[PDB]
């Protein structure tokens, strides 16, 4: 690690928001180095706390502390969602992670839509009425 002349590293904080868990992973600008990867499960094991927003807040906060050591001080936030036969809407940890970043002191200059939306179409599981209980 020499040949820094940017004078302020920037990291594209990736947020994958499933209804089944929330994962928060941060990489530098390139994407070529992962500093942090923290998931809801690693925070707390209980299968319902896994997508829960409090669990997601703390996972994002942990990563955020690591990012500050690095001198990652600005973040782009890239929101996506599951998409191949799931709902394409982002889960609860999106809103939680944005809040953990806002408290954490990492300033957001862009908000980015890299979510799976096809222009070629994908069918999600149902039963001819969608999902039901």
């Amino acid at each position: 690690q020499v040949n820094i002349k940017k004078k302020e590293k920037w990291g594209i904080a990736h947020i994958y928001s499933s209804f089944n868990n929330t994962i928060i992973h941060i990489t530098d600008i390139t994407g070529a180095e992962t500093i942090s990867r923290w998931s809801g499960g690693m925070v707390v094991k209980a299968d319902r706390d896994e997508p829960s927003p409090y669990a997601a807040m703390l996972a994002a906060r942990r990563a955020a502390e690591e990012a500050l050591e690095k001198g990652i001080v600005g973040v782009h936030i890239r929101v996506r969602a599951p998409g191949g036969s799931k709902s394409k809407t982002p889960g609860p940890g999106a809103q939680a992670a944005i809040r953990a970043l806002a408290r954490a002191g990492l300033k957001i200059g862009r908000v980015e839509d890299v979510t799976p939306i096809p222009h070629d179409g994908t069918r999600p599981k149902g039963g001819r009425r969608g999902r039901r209980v």
Partner: protein
Amino acid sequence: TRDKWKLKQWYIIYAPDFFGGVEVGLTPADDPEKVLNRVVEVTLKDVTGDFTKSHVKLYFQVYDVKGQNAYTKFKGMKLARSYIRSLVRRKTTRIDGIFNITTKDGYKLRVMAMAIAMRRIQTSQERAIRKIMQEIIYKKAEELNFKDFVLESVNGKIAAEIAKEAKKIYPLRKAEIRKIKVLEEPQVIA
């Protein structure tokens, strides 16, 4: 983590004759020569000008790295979903012009351009408009050098001009260069 980080080597983006150079953007890697094909997104912090403001995101791909300084060429432009969905509207038309450009500098360029119709009337004048959009973009591109053309194409100068000559046939609104993808780069390395 995994490293010191000192096993990881960091390299720094410079793009002579593309923007004249930059000093923003860093690429870490493990081992030398795993950064030769990596694509780096910068908004640009060397300018707060129109490239940053209204043409938000530019992608540059480090083609080669020499002596731990990274020589970089234009990989792409794009907008985002926020712009495309905002500007489009109902009871109108969306018009898009694809052309595959050959420039005389040894670069091949693909432009998608985004033109938005002035309200009512779906007419063959639309498709007529597409003929014109390809022809104009080609003439500007053909004359100039690739460094010159990229600066005009990403900037509003090209959009603003397409709208003036089209406007005469059939009025337009809200013309933009949705994306530019460098169909083929190399002309000085294989």
